[PDB]
Design a binder for this molecule. Sequence first.
Ligand SMILES: *[C@@](O)(C(=O)NCCCN1CCN(C)CC1)[C@H](CC)NC(=O)[C@H](CC(C)C)NC(=O)OCc1ccccc1
Ligand SMILES: [Ca+2]
Ligand SMILES: [Ca+2]
Ligand SMILES: [Cl-]
Ligand SMILES: [Cl-]
Ligand SMILES: [Cl-]
Length: 322
Amino acid sequence: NAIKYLGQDYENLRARCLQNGVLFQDDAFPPVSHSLGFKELGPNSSKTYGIKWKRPTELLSNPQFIVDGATRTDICQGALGDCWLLAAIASLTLNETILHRVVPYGQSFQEGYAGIFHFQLWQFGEWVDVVVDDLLPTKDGKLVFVHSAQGNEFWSALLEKAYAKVNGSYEALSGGCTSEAFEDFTGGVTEWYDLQKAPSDLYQIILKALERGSLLGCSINISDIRDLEAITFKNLVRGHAYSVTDAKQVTYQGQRVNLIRMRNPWGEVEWKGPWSDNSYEWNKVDPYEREQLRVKMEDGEFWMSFRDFIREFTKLEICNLT
Ligand SMILES: *[C@@](O)(C(=O)NCCCN1CCN(C)CC1)[C@H](CC)NC(=O)[C@H](CC(C)C)NC(=O)OCc1ccccc1
Ligand SMILES: [Ca+2]
Ligand SMILES: [Ca+2]
Ligand SMILES: [Cl-]
Ligand SMILES: [Cl-]
Ligand SMILES: [Cl-]
């Protein structure tokens, strides 16, 4: 069993709040500006001033912890520099086993609800259980930070809040390393690859990792500083964490082509080159392959050929488990 972060005991706190007729408020990460941040989200900042802390049960009549499963579409980035963390959460959802260690079963806004949730992280060399109250930063009734494409679903907002808590504040999450979040979800071994010096068998390495449920992420280095914009000519975002979510092969005019699928944790803004949702390449594959693989949706997720992938991206990170 996970040991309790700060000695806070989820089931005991929940049961005592229920008995006492109150909702949990977390002394260890309270609903005040110091939990938001210190500079950009400090007590005297423009961003801090508009934010009000509200529970999902104050926002909606029927809030849900999980709706139609805990999946990657549930990860839509808000106003914070935590793309690395969110890419890691999106990847985590592809492995049901490790997903449900991090996100314990049986949490809800219905029977037994007392305004407290918990998650498990690999921290301080231990598996630790971390509680949060469900007060969330909002503005005009909408979540400021991570949210689900399903507007009534809250597990990912709550997980991001627990991760903020262990790190001291939401602002503490701005700017980071995908591999760090990978490790914090698995206690696994991380490795990275320089895509400009990719091993000849890299695609097979990727296939194998995806098969075993390893976590994969990629990024494009900003080499000049930010000159050719944050966004590239083909609509990729530089200095930004993407989740790698699949690797599949297609028959393009009678010849195999290796493809790779990734997801922008914004839940929008995608590659517009070959193999993108609207590209001509799909016209020339097996109709079945097209129907199985292509999804015409602005959802942040898209395909590239492996060839284009290794040209456009610069870094690949893989976290391997047991
Ligand atoms: C990352 O790209 C990010 O979080 N961007 C925020 C985008 C804001 N969205 C835009 C869309 N709308 C709808 C919602 C708001 C982030 C920006 C800093 N990138 C990273 O953190 C980098 C990830 C790597 C995989 C490239 N890492 C990084 O910048 O490292 C810096 C660093 C390292 C150590 C300590 C501090 C900072
Ligand atoms: Ca969902
Ligand atoms: Ca898409
Ligand atoms: Cl407490
Ligand atoms: Cl304040
Ligand atoms: Cl629920």
